[PDB]
Symmetry: C3
Subunit: 125 residues, 3 copies
């Protein structure tokens, strides 16, 4: 019915949330932020941050039995709409052949003062 996805390959979801759920053949990821497995921000650089988020999401999807080519929808929450071209360049490297639906908005603030946070909805397989 429902699967709860948590991988020690990734920085822990501390406290009351998990890396992803799988319900009715759909994966719902948590928002990923640019932490490595030690739970440290990888870089001040917004392109380095976007790559770590997308590398994190590739692992979530693998563990949930999905892949990037199965993504229906991404939401990109960012700190600075002026970084959008830089973020979009890196995103386009992960979403080349497959181009899912997307929304990108500038928020006030992200966890740990990170610059980018991305959540996915993906199909199993």
């Amino acid at each position: 019915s429902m699967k709860i996805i948590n991988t020690t390959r990734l920085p822990e979801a501390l406290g009351p949330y998990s890396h992803a759920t799988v319900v009715n053949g759909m994966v719902y990821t948590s928002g990923q932020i640019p932490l490595n497995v030690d739970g440290k921000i990888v870089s001040a650089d917004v392109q380095a941050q976007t790559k770590q988020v997308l590398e994190n999401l590739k692992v979530v999807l693998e563990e949930a039995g999905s892949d990037l080519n199965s993504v229906a929808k991404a939401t990109i929450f960012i700190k600075d709409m002026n970084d959008f071209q830089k973020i979009n360049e890196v995103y386009g490297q992960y979403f080349n052949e497959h181009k899912p639906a997307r929304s990108c908005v500038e928020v006030a603030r992200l966890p740990k003062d990170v610059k980018v946070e991305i959540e996915l909805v993906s199909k199993i397989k």
Copy 2:
């Protein structure tokens, strides 16, 4: 498609409903900390968070779901410095069951509240 609107909460006034149910999935509206009179309960962020989750529990129940069936939660907040206080209350509702979550600080919330939460949940 089933439209959910419970009289156990203040009416969703204007062009929305408490939730919809489609293909065995409940999509809640973003709840804000209105009491049953439709007044903001308090300026206190832990009270607001509790009011929001109490409201969402009633929505899930009237939609044929429950908090243990939640897939995904999105938490929109006014102040990321309140995150630990919000998380404490949140973990009283999602204690054994820990669904997927995103939490961002927005610029401003309806009625200048400090938290709004929406859920995606499985029908039991």
Copy 3:
């Protein structure tokens, strides 16, 4: 999974599509108030809301869905002071059918538009 791109609307720039359709559901990209020339139709927030909802009406049709099939709307806005005016336009599109909704004020939207709306919808019949 089906990819939706309509020529009726300004092209998705780079690595996204107008919508995806997967397991009987349409996920739309967030629509901003661009006309078919990809220009911001107007400074007026009610004209912008109208263009957004006209753009989403066409995505839903191309996806094989409609406004009376919508499960969930997310309304991103630049100014909570505009909420009454946006809601007035939105209620014209959602009078017979009232979906679930979330509405939040973001710091900034693409091209400094005042409103952006994404939808999750059921395939029609």
